[PDB]
């Protein structure tokens, strides 16, 4: 006969049930291959068609085997990925790189997988942790040495983390989260370029800048901040700017007074480096 698969959307548990439907002694079987997290020890399992496992959000190759001879067909299950709006505290530094992510139950084995975006393909990195419990803050952690290029290059990385209490059982993996991160010294690299100040009215100016390099990496750029300094009163003002906007209007300026403007780009966890200061007057 002919069989077609169905899949649920990823649930809060990081699972989704692969179901089956028939639309055309004989034996029918299923071979299941988990593609994501390649550094895991066990990657395939042969199952009965009737038991419908709860997969993770990883990518899978599923193929139907029939025994009597038989026939074999395969469908590549796409990796549906949840988006965590809160960015993870990923710190790239002089001595190495460190991650923190929300942990769940105790004695959990985690697989961290990342690959640089838009060299679409390439350096696919995979990491498997020893079983570990949540810290008092409810977080798990792992670290790499400086030599380990773990997000050490100033590029956008796509990260996916999986969890299992029994990593040797293929059908027990769950998705934790997926996220984007810009590696290296993102605070310095994220500095906006081509900052310009233009006369908008007799008492207002338009400030424009090129989009930060962080804006190309989804969810990384939290906001822009524009700092304006009155060089006579020494008064300073900061204006947060939506990450989708690269322009802001400053009003209430006084004639003859010199002003200074700087722009920075902030992530959820890092203050950006200020741009070169702009000197101007009405």
């Amino acid at each position, epitope marked *: 006969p002919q069989v077609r698969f169905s899949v649920e959307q990823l649930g809060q548990d990081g699972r989704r049930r692969l179901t089956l439907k028939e639309q055309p002694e004989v*034996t029918y079987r299923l071979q299941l291959h988990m593609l994501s997290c390649p550094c895991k020890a*066990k990657a395939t399992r042969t199952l009965h068609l009737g038991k419908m496992p*709860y997969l993770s959000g990883a990518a899978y190759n599923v193929a139907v085997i029939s025994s009597n001879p038989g026939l074999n067909q395969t469908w590549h299950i796409p990796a549906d990925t949840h988006t965590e709006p809160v960015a993870l505290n990923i710190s790239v530094g002089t001595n190495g790189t460190t991650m923190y992510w929300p942990a769940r*139950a105790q004695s959990m084995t985690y697989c961290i997988e990342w690959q640089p975006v838009g060299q679409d393909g390439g350096l696919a990195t995979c990491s498997l942790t020893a079983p570990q419990d949540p810290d008092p803050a409810g977080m798990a952690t792992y670290s790499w040495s400086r030599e380990s290029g773990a997000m050490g290059q100033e590029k956008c990385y796509y990260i996916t983390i999986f969890a299992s*209490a029994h990593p040797e059982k293929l*059908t027990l993996w769950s998705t934790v989260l997926s996220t984007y991160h810009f590696g290296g010294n993102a605070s310095a690299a994220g500095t906006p370029h081509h900052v310009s100040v233009k006369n908008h009215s007799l008492d207002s100016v338009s400030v424009d800048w090129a989009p930060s390099l962080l804006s190309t990496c989804p969810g990384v750029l939290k906001e822009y901040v524009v700092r304006c300094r009155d060089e006579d009163s020494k008064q300073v003002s900061e204006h947060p700017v939506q990450p989708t906007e690269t322009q802001v209007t400053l009003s209430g300026l006084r004639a003859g007074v010199a002003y200074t403007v700087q722009v920075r780009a902030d992530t959820a966890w890092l203050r950006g480096v200020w741009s070169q200061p702009q000197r101007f007057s009405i």
Partner: antibody
Amino acid sequence: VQLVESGGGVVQPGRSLRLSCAASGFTFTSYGMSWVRQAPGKGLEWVAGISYDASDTEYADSVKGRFTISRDNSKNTLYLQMNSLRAEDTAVYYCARSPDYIIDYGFDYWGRGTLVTVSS
Amino acid sequence: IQMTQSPSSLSASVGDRVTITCRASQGISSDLAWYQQKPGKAPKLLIYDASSLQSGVPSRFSGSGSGTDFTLTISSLQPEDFATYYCQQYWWYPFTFGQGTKVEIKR
């Protein structure tokens, strides 16, 4: 992790008896459960199983129409309703845990077991 | 699915290398488990997925095989290993056990 069976004893043939298993030490709602019985001088026989959300239930052929497995996830209790009991059902009944959502793989935790004697 | 173990019983001494076989009436790939039971006690899971060792089990235990023929192996028999051993398929419902193999002490 502990599993405690209760409700066993003597029961006349054709009558009914309800077994209960109390679970503790883990998240009861996240694991499938099963019952396994063992006649005194005999080997092991899998009786019934149920998934984590009680959506999947399976029974052995020798008990299909006669037994009923169920779970109360709010009270961490597994149940086995036995009706129309025969003498062959006389066995020690264990409750055991499955490591996944679905009824799958081996049984990593077992209870003490309770004796059920079916006789008049 | 019928699960046939061989032999039904065997006698061995401490230190011996023990091998039990398990045979399935139908092909079950790797969905097989092994259990150990002592008189008057609940069974204990030793090996799953035909060859994965369960946590806490000593390294002297090992399993292998696929399809219809499976083997359980104890490299060096220890005094606490004398018991009865059962294989079980979970390839499909209803789950079925083998008849058991009793490992006794030879004298």
